[model samples]
Target: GKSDKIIPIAENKEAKAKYDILETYEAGIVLKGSEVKSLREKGTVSFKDSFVRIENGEAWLYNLYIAPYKHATIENHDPLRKRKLLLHKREIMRLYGKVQEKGYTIIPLKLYWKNNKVKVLIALAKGKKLYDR
Candidate 1:
């Protein structure tokens, strides 16, 4: 009886409480067939210790875990493989610029299905101190 339309797959609630978010961007991920199938299981994906990075002018996600599909053959994908995040050149440049500053970092806030494709919500944030809460 609830039709919100948007479907969320996983999230990193840790990021929100650990860092002070500055900006957020909706980005796409390049995934394999088996990984996509595995991602359908919400509990099988984990955002802990997961983070985003900019390398060679491209955005990449590291440590995002998607468990192997149980029904898949021996072609199952790696559970902790680094995934590329799709974003515009300008956006990448902006993130890179901010990341160059001390204490600034990029993190994934959540993952969800958008237009039949998986999209990640990444954010630019500053590390918070123990007393910053």
Candidate 2:
């Protein structure tokens, strides 16, 4: 179905070269009010130190940094906080199965805006061994 649409705003160039992507998915990101405001002004976040993990049947993005909004008065959200990712139960289960195998992982490939909503591009991947690199 066409509902899996995505619009990439930023990408991690290093992740692409360091790991071989097996599959990609578009996911919704649970964001704070400040985080969204920051993203709207900045348009991209740093993924160089970010990663994804599946825990308790759900996926979470870790180490992503959305800078603080310039005019905000309150404290900003933590740049490295683990953020929840929205996905279907079937999809989550499928990823869980794959990650159970050795060397496989879930990685956030990119971030983007879709129909004015923030979205993330995630992937099921396996790291290339020393020889593969």
Candidate 3:
């Protein structure tokens, strides 16, 4: 079964319809070796409750889960560890401004492979009124 591995808050049919996407950015994710292996092979990472947070001008992804490797012993990474994202200073500054506003925040739009490396698609988005839907 051929399918896509895009991350959460977007892939959900209902959730996707609730956001007004303002800006989209592609950034590299900080990953452990075990996490990368699972993503490349089974690739069943969860997007539930996963969102980005800006800390002291740095972007950190929280709640994204990558299940542990079956064969690895004690070397496996914690599935729910917060991962840092790689983005330019100005880019982060711009994102920071919007996120501070009420009802405006960033969420992962997708996850994909590029040149054999994993990249995350994040968006600066605004929440919509569910009543409008």
Candidate 4:
């Protein structure tokens, strides 16, 4: 809404404590019409315990919850569906190599918009073993 707004739709607030982000990339996401509409209306999206999976040579976002738009007439998008993430071929290849490392994983750190395109900030992370819970 504001000038060059970068309002984060979701963020893995517990991420820092649970994992160490080694790399990051900005990527696009596939979303429905009402989903975008909902985001325009302050609908909340959860990055809580969410992570990325690279399978079949594509990146998929799992466990992301995008709340529905209450005012929509129809076509309420499933809040818990597995969403596809967009990235380049070379980027995926590099990330694929990183994921193979022991205890290393990929995760969606933040979701935001750039111009007209919705983008996500994904990270390559390694989990931590803390002394105290």
Candidate 5:
């Protein structure tokens, strides 16, 4: 059945409801073999807090969890390890600039697969105060 409706793998519900999203961008994650297998089976790590940062001209995703595979060898990835995010240099610079400004941050809004590749949905956002939440 072909449909136009878009399905999301995982969504940061707290981020969306708590903060006002200024912009959104699609980025790729650098995953290991075991991590990819785990993600395919257990789904994404939208919860448990996730953030993005640009350092040395590269974007990194921190605090993301891709649980280890049940049937794994001696080598297994950490559950909460920082993963590199693939983004354009211009985008990284732009995000760095925006994040450096007051009350602004880069957050992972969702994680999903696109064209057989794992993709992360990032957003440039401003935090909502206690009153706003």
Candidate 6:
């Protein structure tokens, strides 16, 4: 029940290796209760090919695979659901602008806990060419 314990849930190492990260920002995630419970398992969450997209003046996280809760037979959340990311409109606007130009993109760097809530670390990145990798 510690207030500031940062419990790490998932990370996207591929994003770091494939993108030349320019800047980073932390944002909160909007999640279902069942999806929250499912994250307790060490191996239940994955960030394979996950990325962040700005749409309709908002940011959304795509392909963040959170497995369904084991004991929730009655109802469960989708593993590949596109989750909403909480960020200020000003920040969203900046990301949107950068993405529109050149080869810029938004990547999910990591996911962790703070004050028992899930937070996402997203970054502004430019794709690394074959020579860089």
**Residue pairs in candidate 4 whose N, alpha carbon or C atoms collide under 3 angstroms:** none
For residues 15-126, could you state the per-residue lDDT of candidate 2 as single tens digits?
6667667777666775656655566666556547677777665667776654434545577655676677777778777767766565687777667766556677787656
Question: What are the lDDT scores of the predictions, listed in order?
Answer: 0.69, 0.66, 0.63, 0.67, 0.66, 0.69
| TM-scores for all predictions | 0.73, 0.70, 0.69, 0.72, 0.70, 0.73
Query: Which pairs, if any, clash in model 2?
Result: none
In candidate 2 the C-alpha lDDT for residue 4 amounts to: 59
Candidate 2 vs 3: which has more lDDT? 2
Instruction: Please provide, for model 5 over 26-110, each residue's C-alpha lDDT reduced to its tens digit, 9 standing for 90 to 100.
Output: 6787555665556666654546565677676766777665443464577776566776767787877776776666568777766
Residue 24, candidate 4: alpha-carbon lDDT:
77
Q: For residues 1-133, what per-residue lDDT tens digits would candidate 1 score against the true structure? A: 1865555766766766777777877678866666565556544566576777877666777774544446547775566677777778887787787665656888777787655568887887776765753
- How far residue 4's Cα lies from its native spot in candidate 3, in Å, is 15
Q: How far in Å is the alpha carbon of 41 misplaced in model 4? A: 0.5
Q: Which tens-of-lDDT digit does each residue in 6-96 have in candidate 3?
A: 4322233334567776677667775567656565667555556667676565666776554434645677655666767777788787777
Candidate 4 residue spans exceeding 4 A from truth:
4-7, 69-79, 129-133
TM-score of 6: 0.73
How much lDDT does candidate 1 score? 0.69
Candidate 1: residue pairs that collide? none
> Where's the lowest-lDDT run of ten residues in candidate 3?
6-15
The lDDT of model 5 is: 0.66
All candidates: CA RMSD (Å): 3.3, 5.1, 4.6, 3.6, 3.9, 3.6
Q: lDDT of candidate 3 vs native? A: 0.63
How far out, in Å, is residue 64 in model 6?
A: 5.7
> How far out, in Å, is residue 59 in model 3?
2.8
